[PDB]
Design a binder for these strands. Sequence first.
DNA 1: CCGCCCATCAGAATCCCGGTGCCGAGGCCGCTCAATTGGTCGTAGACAGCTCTAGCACCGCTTAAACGCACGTACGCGCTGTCCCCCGCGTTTTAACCGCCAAGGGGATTACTCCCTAGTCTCCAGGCACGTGTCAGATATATACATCGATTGCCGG
DNA 2: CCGGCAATCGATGTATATATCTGACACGTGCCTGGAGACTAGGGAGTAATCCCCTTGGCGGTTAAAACGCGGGGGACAGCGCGTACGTGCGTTTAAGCGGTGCTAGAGCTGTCTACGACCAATTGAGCGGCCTCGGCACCGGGATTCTGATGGGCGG
Lengths: 74, 103, 105, 78, 83, 93, 95, 97, 97
Amino acid sequence: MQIFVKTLTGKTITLEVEPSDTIENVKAKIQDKEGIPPDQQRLIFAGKQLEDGRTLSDYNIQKESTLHLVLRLR
Amino acid sequence: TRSSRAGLQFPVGRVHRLLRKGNYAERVGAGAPVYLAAVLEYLTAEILELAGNAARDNKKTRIIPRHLQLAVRNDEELNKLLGRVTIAQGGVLPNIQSVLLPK
Amino acid sequence: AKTRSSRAGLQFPVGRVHRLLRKGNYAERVGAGAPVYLAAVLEYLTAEILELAGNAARDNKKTRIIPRHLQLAVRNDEELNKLLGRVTIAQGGVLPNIQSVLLPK
Amino acid sequence: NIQGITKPAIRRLARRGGVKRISGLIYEETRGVLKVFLENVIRDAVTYTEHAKRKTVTAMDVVYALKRQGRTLYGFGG
Amino acid sequence: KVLRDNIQGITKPAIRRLARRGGVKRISGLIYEETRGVLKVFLENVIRDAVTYTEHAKRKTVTAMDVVYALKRQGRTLYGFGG
Amino acid sequence: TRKESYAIYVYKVLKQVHPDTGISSKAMSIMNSFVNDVFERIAGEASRLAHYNKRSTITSREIQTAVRLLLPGELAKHAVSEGTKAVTCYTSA
Amino acid sequence: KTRKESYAIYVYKVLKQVHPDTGISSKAMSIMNSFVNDVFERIAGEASRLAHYNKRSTITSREIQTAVRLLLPGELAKHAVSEGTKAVTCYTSAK
Amino acid sequence: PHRYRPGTVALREIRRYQKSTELLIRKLPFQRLVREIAQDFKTDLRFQSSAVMALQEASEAYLVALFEDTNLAAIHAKRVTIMPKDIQLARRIRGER
Amino acid sequence: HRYRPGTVALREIRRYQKSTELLIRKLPFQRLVREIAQDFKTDLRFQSSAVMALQEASEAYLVALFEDTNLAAIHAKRVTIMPKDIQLARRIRGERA
DNA sequence: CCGCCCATCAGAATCCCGGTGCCGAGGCCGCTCAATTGGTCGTAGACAGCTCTAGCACCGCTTAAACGCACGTACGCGCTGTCCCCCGCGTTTTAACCGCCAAGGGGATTACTCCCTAGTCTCCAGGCACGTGTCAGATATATACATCGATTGCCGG
DNA sequence: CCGGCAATCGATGTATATATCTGACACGTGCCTGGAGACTAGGGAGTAATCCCCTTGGCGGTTAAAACGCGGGGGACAGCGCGTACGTGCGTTTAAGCGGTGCTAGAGCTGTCTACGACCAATTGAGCGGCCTCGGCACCGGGATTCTGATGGGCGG
């Protein structure tokens, strides 16, 4: 399904990622479509820092979600 | 500060002061303000996340009381918690009984 | 006079009420007249309820008051019913009441 | 001044309540129930104001009264 | 010992007696099951609160004071069993 | 251990009101619960009143306002009269 | 112009944590302040009653935990208990 | 053969049970149900007899009040028989989810 | 042309269930509040916020009452609300004795 | 051959889009007061141990209540007709809302003093635990009265 | 010559009167813990003065909302018919209730000692009040899209 990811520059990107796909897969797809290194990417959903060892379904990410970049929570 | 040690955003010292000057008990333990601040922060985060989603649905970038009302009334646990609370300038959920609809 | 109730001319205890107020986590300080006022109010309410319940007991040709008489006394008074609106009395029962549409014609 | 609560206003309140057809004897009942509710709340608020030795009724007194009656209200300084 | 099927111990005559004390003359045949469900929900809530109260005190026995405190929390004050 | 209750004072009031009627054991328990409940209600209301006005003491004014807020219409008048009479008698003596 | 305290800055920090690009108005801020205050009073009063029942002179994290379990419904209580326990453990570990 | 018409013994029962004060449910079934319900939250639990007594009193009071409201709702619809819809309407208006 | 009965009613239901404005004029409500207050104590003053809060609470109360009244009217196989529905709702809620 | 059901038109009503502007939300700066740190001290509570009470389990016997079945009647529900009363729309009236001005009552702050409350120590008496007698009330039995439903007589159609 | 209405008559259920015994209530006794009395120290609250902010009152306009009336369609209500579900009674079965017995886990109390919370003093930075600036949202005008209801048509009893 298609998710919206927003960067610090206000750019909105559409990602076609399955719910069972891991966060590392999302980072790989973002790098493929944008060139941003996965280690330089920090995605967040529901005010939580996503971990590459989990999947979209682990974070209960549903359709038409919104993700943000860089912001860290600790 | 104590919030920094606890890794929180809400104030621990202020909560401790409010507990000590509220006529609740003779003494207050060291971890009670930390526990209370963590719980308050969690509840605030939940409500704010729902309200922000409601604001995004309306194509708005600012939260108004209507969004808070829509967030609270559409969640079962939040509706149970705030069951006897009136939010000013909130409104109601759109709902029409099926008998009144035209055939 | 020696005790505070006798000075106030009451039956309920003023010293015990003062002690309960001072240790109930209500305020930093407690004034001198607050126990007297509270004791007088409590005594008045007790007297009202007991008078009504004793009348109810006398109606049933009884000498002792049982929870049924207290329930009858409370439920038949408007102000007492308003005050004890969300209170359940054990072994009390209900007021006899049948809707008019259910009676035979 | 109870007649200043006009029939169209009551109809609008009913529309927000989800009501389609309204009988002609509903407006008097609505006025009565509103009067009772206002009487209770204003009595409590004026008691609160009088305890503080003020000649002006503030929003805090109204909020305290409503909380006493069991109807918490958010957004006015509570 | 784990026991089941105890909701059926609330027999139809008992529900009829409760309805008679309530002032009801005629009762439909589908009322008993709904009454059982309502009673089950009420008991579940009260017992949950009372068991929480008992656990906080580090006791293995539920007392009448826990029940009274629970009921007061649910906004149903009860007179007679202490308090 | 000693357990305190209101039984003796309730019995004295009852003998003042009905000088021949008695009382059972469950009725006295109900009376004890009633007295305790009213005590907690009035005390809590007075404490909240003191907190609102930024005061650190509870006086007879707080009790009077609390019984005016809590008790219904005609009960409050007689309760206020009784409390005022008791306070005046206590102060004069 | 006496100083008046509120929860506005902390609520704004939380909001910027959950939704990085989203604002809030003054009325919504007032509603949030009232909500935080209300929940505070409820939990504190429940804990005070719990301490009174068991004849204790102190309020500890056990009282707060039991009050949260008594007041909050269902999954809310579970997540709140987890958050509070994590915060207390983190505070104790650091010194 | 003597026989009463329908509704007579019902009124007699209404009068009889509105003047007594005893409990209307057997004690052993209620005790068993309470223990089974409490088994879900915590095992190896013991109860005082007073606790079960208080639970029974509260439950019976709740049910009697609910039946009064149900009778009112049934009469509002020009009926003398109570149906599950009346119970549902009473619970919904009261505010019980 | 002309719309059939019930159409504009549904339009009004839809449009008033999505707004948040107050549905009562301010001057009449202020006058009513002032006279009700003068029933108790004279020479009393009001903040504007007090009247605003009173209006908000009153409108919320009335809207909830009308929701319950509509439910009661539907229970009796009707689409028109009547004073008996209001009385039944208030009685079941507990406000009416 | 005509009443009932179905496809198709214009016309209000709501929404979306684009340009304009304007006021509130978000960021920056100075200060002061409350939170942090470090040390001391007293006591609230945890922990171990002992005692004895009440909660749990089991067995036997009586009997009242529950359960299953049959029969019949009264109530619930659906249909039909009427009749009236609420809804939708057009015209006229009114008062609400906005803008502006003026005046003064009272709410909020501050300085000062003093008197009411807390804390300490001593003494003693009232309330609680325990024990005992007796009488209000539950129990059993007999009896009188009220009500309910079937039977039958009577005025009238 | 039957029906509806009205007045009897037997059966059943409920309240009332009279011993009878018992278990709970009311009263008497000892003691110990909490309340009363006397005194001291200190801060919370009352009181007076000042200031300015906000509440109250009045006037003018304009315009949208309220008030009034009318025509009509749809909903509320009443009567009628039918059928089935619920009430009343009887015979059979079951388990609740009572009365013992035994046993053990746990609730309740006591002594000790110790880690934790209160209190105090000095320091300092976080949060609050004030000011500015621009962008999200309110506003206005125009076109697009969507129901809604009348109109034409077709069809089958």
